[PDB]
Amino acid sequence: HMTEYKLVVVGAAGVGKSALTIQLIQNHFVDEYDPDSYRKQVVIDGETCLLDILDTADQYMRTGEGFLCVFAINNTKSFEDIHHYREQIKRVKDSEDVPMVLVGNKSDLPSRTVDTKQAQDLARSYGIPFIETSAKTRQGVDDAFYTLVREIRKHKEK
Numbered sequence: 001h002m003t004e005y006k007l008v009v010v011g012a013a014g015v016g017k018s019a020l021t022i023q024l025i026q027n028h029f030v031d032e033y034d035p036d037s038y039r040k041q042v043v044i045d046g047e048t049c050l051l052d053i054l055d056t057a058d059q060y061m062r063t064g065e066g067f068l069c070v071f072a073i074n075n076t077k078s079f080e081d082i083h084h085y086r087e088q089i090k091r092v093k094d095s096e097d098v099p100m101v102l103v104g105n106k107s108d109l110p111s112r113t114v115d116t117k118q119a120q121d122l123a124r125s126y127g128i129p130f131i132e133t134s135a136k137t138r139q140g141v142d143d144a145f146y147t148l149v150r151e152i153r154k155h156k157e158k
């Protein structure tokens, strides 16, 4: 009675992968978590979905159905590292069409070193959606995860 979607959250250290996941799971913002798998049942477009979410630093990398590729909008390096995460995902999947969303987190912070245009340009080159989030305020969090689910459906029957 529920459709399972296996999601994997990747990106450089400190960008907010756990905070985003915890927002989705607990509806709470964690300032300090310890640098595993989570399950969430949610109805997306009339379908009861069981999300299976791996918050990374492989099994889930080979078996993940879709990826959130997260950088922080005040961490230029994390943005630059997206290329390396995306290449990695493509290698395993032997495909240039893997369900993925580009997420620019920490939108509440004033210190923005990656502009929205840089991010939009990158997502456009990859053929994927770009969503801005804050795990702190919860702006964009559901959007990012729901959009990923929709991208998985777009690529394959579920």
Ligand SMILES: Nc1nc2c(ncn2[C@@H]2O[C@H](COP(=O)(O)OP(=O)(O)OP(O)(O)=S)[C@@H](O)[C@H]2O)c(=O)[nH]1
Pocket: 011, 012, 013, 014, 015, 016, 017, 018, 019, 020, 030, 031, 032, 033, 034, 035, 056, 057, 105, 106, 107, 108, 109, 133, 134, 135, 136, 137
């Ligand atoms: N202001 C603000 N801080 C955030 C946001 N998301 C995460 N943080 C903070 O950034 C720090 C890193 O977040 P965290 O979720 O631990 O990163 P991560 O990508 O999971 O890091 P890793 O080391 O486990 S591989 C934490 O102190 C967390 O509170 C956000 O949207 N806004």
Ligand SMILES: [Mg+2]
Pocket: 017, 018, 019, 033, 034, 035, 055, 056
């Ligand atoms: Mg973490």
